Amino acid sequence: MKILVRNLDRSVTEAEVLELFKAYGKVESCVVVTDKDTGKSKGFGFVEMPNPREAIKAIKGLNTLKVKGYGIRVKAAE
C-alpha cells in the first residue's frame, strides 16, 4: 500500500518519518520532501508498506500526529 504524508515541517527528515511508520509494520520505501521550495509546513512524503493491514493501522495511528508542531496528514494514495 502506498501512503501519502502531508504537512511536514522543513525540519522533518526521511529517517524521522521512517521510524514513525516502522512502529506499525514493515516499510519498503520512504520518500520525504522537505526543501526550501516546500515551506516549514508543506513538506510531503510517500511511504510504501507492503502489508495493507499494517499500512491501514499506520494511517489511522499517525494521521493528525504533531511532528515539529504541525499535525501531519496521512492517507492511502488510492
Author numbering: 19 to 96
From the article:
Here, we identified an RRM-containing protein in Acinetobacter baumannii that we called AB-Elavl, starting from a protein similarity search with the human ELAV-like protein HuR.
The crystals diffracted up to 1.6 Å resolution: they belong to space group I41 with one molecule in the asymmetric unit, a solvent content of about 50%, and a mosaicity of 0.3°. The X-ray structure showed the domain of an RRM domain: β1-α1-β2-β3-α2-β4 with an additional β5 segment present right before the C-terminus of the protein. The solved structure shows the absence of the first 18 residues in the electron density with respect to the cloned sequence. It is not trivial to tell whether this is due to their high mobility or rather to their loss due to some protein degradation before/during crystallization. It appears quite clear that the fold of rAB-Elavl is very similar to that of the model used for structure solution and, in turn, similar to the typical RRM. The greatest discrepancy between the two structures is in the region involving residues from 50 to 58, just before RNP-1. In our case electron density is missing for those residues, confirming thus very high mobility. The structure of the bacterial RRM domain appears very similar to the eukaryotic one but for the presence of an additional short β strand and a more flexible central region.
